[PDB]
Design a protein around this nucleic acid. Sequence first.
RNA 1: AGGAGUUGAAGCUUGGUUCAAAGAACGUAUCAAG
Lengths: 303, 214, 214, 135, 139, 125
Amino acid sequence: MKKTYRVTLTALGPIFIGGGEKLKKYEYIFDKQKKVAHMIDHTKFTKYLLEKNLLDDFTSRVNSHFDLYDYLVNKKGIVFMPLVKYSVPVAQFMNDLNTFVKDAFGRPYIPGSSLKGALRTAILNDLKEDTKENEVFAHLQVSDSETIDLENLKVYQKVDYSKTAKPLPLYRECLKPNTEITFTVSFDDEYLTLKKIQNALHKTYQHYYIKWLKGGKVGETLIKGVPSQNQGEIIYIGGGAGFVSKTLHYKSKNRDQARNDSFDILKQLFRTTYSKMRSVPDNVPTGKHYLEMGKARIKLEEL
Amino acid sequence: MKLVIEGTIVLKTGMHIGGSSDFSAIGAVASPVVRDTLTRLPLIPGSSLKGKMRYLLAKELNNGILLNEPNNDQDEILRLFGSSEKDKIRRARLKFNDIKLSNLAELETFNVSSTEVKFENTINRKTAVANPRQIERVIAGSKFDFEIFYNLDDIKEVEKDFENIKQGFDLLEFDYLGGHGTRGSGRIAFENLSVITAVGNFEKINTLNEILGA
Amino acid sequence: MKLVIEGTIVLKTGMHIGGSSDFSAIGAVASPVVRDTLTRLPLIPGSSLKGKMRYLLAKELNNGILLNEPNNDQDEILRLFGSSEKDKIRRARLKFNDIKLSNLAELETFNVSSTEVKFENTINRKTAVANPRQIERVIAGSKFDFEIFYNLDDIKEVEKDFENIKQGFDLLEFDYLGGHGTRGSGRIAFENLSVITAVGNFEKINTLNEILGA
Amino acid sequence: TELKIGNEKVNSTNFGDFAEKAIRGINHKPFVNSKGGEQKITTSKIRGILELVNKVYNRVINTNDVELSENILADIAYIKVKIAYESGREPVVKDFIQRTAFTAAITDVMNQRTRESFLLFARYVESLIAYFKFY
Amino acid sequence: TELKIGNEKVNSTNFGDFAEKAIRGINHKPFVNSKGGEQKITTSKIRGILELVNKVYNRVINTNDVELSENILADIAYIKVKIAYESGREPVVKDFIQRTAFTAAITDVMNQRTRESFLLFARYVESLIAYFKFYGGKD
Amino acid sequence: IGNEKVNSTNFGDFAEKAIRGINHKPFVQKITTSKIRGILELVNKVYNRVINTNDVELSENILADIAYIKVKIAYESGREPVVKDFIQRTAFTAAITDVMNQRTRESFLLFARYVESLIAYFKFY
RNA sequence: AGGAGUUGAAGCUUGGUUCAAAGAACGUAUCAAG
């Protein structure tokens, strides 16, 4: 009977939704050596360059590709910088930034399709037979969030942790952790309820741990580490959380599913396949945390 | 003797509605939004608003379940929206209209365009290969000034009919308006509701703004 | 004398009228809009305007509701729109005309076709399966310069006749003109309204032009 | 009146019969998808092709002139490009276009820039999908 | 002057009788839509078929030559396309079209491309609609 | 509607000729399906804002957009030699400079349809 | 130092409803009858 619930998505790890906006080595990005990044708007940048020596400054910077690293801003007296939409901090340890999805007002939010995809991945831990006419997802009403303040965004380094952590040249503009994101979700009780959602998220997280990530934490594992079950109301929002987060087929044994997706992804591609996959954390500093990526905490409240 | 229900629909979320005959570029948006094709500036069809209002009223009246054909709704719904059964055709006392965007000047104050391309995909859960799409979605905080002509038939039912109309205004607050609304779109807010006469003067019209614009 | 009631009908919404008399494609419009077939310019039939105006005016007169045949209206409506009852037959004082689309150059100035396709659907209430339809519909802001001939037969009744005519136009401003009107189309308005003589001069022509020019 | 496919002609008394023969060519010897399996084209792909044509058809049957305009024939060229692209998407669409010779018809329309040639092409596409759904 | 349907030919002495036999054969053995109950074609679909015929019939009756012009035959072939389309959509339409044999009639109209053949077809369909309303009407 | 020898009609034919010229006697490693799509995505990101405008001329911000995608494809050409041969054998930068010296909306739609036809006919062969 | 690859997929393309209603159906004049 349209059981509306207020979902407060506590961002336990870095949450990234992307939205189709790639930021290149020096293309709208302004990264300085004080461990923060500023970013600019294309219109005011282009008219600020076309007001002063149009063909000259275009041919100078086009000559200076690819080595730019925003010190033409310093040498040319262009230290005058009104081109700050918002400032973002960078977590390092060569640049290609992916930014978070923002609405037309330039103030970020998580769209409701993302959260429905996450809960659909959490609910579908029955057999993978649920097609595009399943009646249970036509009665789940999830909205977007309110506009998150721009100070809760942080640029991270994507690190891979298979045997030992090594970085990959890919920055994505995630959320800083313990950040509360507020959704409003409603559904028909004839198909799913609070109990089904908490049990599905609990089941998905516990199989995610005991079939792949506890195996990460004990197998091919050393002291490079220096969280279950807490309640457990934990889901993975699509921040590059991994292959096994997005799929569902760690149902219903550890072995045959691992060799199945082993063949399936890493046979047809270039690198050689066998056990096991690689884990993707992020990192912040001098001691490091190696805090893991895509995870979040989910709370359900009556109205 | 008609009444005009002036109002304003305030967008909280995207509200992608409609099918266009626009040719879609392949690196661009597919299935764009419906527009008022003179300027082709964004449009809310009257048929969409009528369909959602009739659906949400026909759920709350006949409380809960709904599996019947639209001519077999309750008497309030048929006398408010119309009928096509052979014995008793009811001429609709409501008359919806296509609602064009009104606050484009308010949007040019904020210096944003009137609509936005939203990026979505679909992850096939077997091999985790995606399948992208773009949808053209109106921005939030856009107003839509509308007016619905109430055709007064008899004053014994006008109070009940505006109570049902405010009920359907309330019910559409908690449900989408059109398009991919189960996934976060179409959240509307009926703000600054009012009613007025066309010609002449309804003597009990001060009670009608109390049961509607409140 | 005869008088000519000159004016124009401006569209605020779609106004889909009519049925061809044309073949249909199997991915295109069903029920296309009616056209003047020599020029393939969209047309308002004079029958549609006369029927809607007669229904609205004989709904206002006979205060409340009308349920009778066209031959059983009051003498104002019978003398204004003709009659065919057996002995008390009355020739129509008004002669309507087929109204072609009149501002095609000002539609082409904004670089758009004279008509649009408006995508619709309906969902089955028990199976949620959609059922799309496409209706051709005239674009909003299309102007229709019309003219209606009036037959000045009794000079002491022309005041009440033009009072009734302005009443009928002012009612038809708050109602659709044809087709899918309750679902957001057909809303028109009347502009440039005046009356001129056919040949000669009518003595109180200013009292008719003032009662229409307000 | 005239529209060539190969050395074999289709005209405006006749498009239903070549739509018969074209679809009955798609059946009885269907596409092979680089496997031992069978595969025929789905409804949504060919009817997206139909909606691609009918975005132009609604502005041609509404008009008067015996020669197509430049906006219309520009969108005809766009239809040919979209045919090439969604041919490049899937091989089953490529062999559907190659057997039910659609590029030949759309190039015939682009050569003879008359109104009735495109209307015949629209008849042929609608008849293709009619005999797809009939079987 | 004599239209072929199956193994028995129909002309302007039998089309009312043939259409009466066809309609009264549609009753006493109706169509089943792969569920428990029977289902026959409704008024609106066969009025769609009759409207498709009448869109050419309104033009043919004001023509001169005994052989039809090419735009008439274009529209007849497109009627054949439309009937083949609408029958493939709903199987209750396919049953009515095959049993009250329509496609064979319109093909043999297209073979003998004469005016009298199309008039024979049009009066055949008109009689078919007439007898459908005559037997078991729901008005 | 001229726009440097390629009309509103023969844009796909020119792109088909260009891709067929690419396909036999190619550069050395042929061009992949990701950079050319990146070009497509940047030009259609400009195209969405362009086609939802109202008038038949271009704003200042739109000329900023075509100028900045010119310097973006200058950067991307400066990355790889194969995309240099791609943009050289195309009249791409010529089309951008003609959009600079023409500043008409229909020319931008023609160029967008040209690069869409480049994507399409690269995919077709 | 970033490379590739998915750029939309599937479904419905109108459904049902009245499908010409009420009037006049020749009136007169020579002819004739008176």
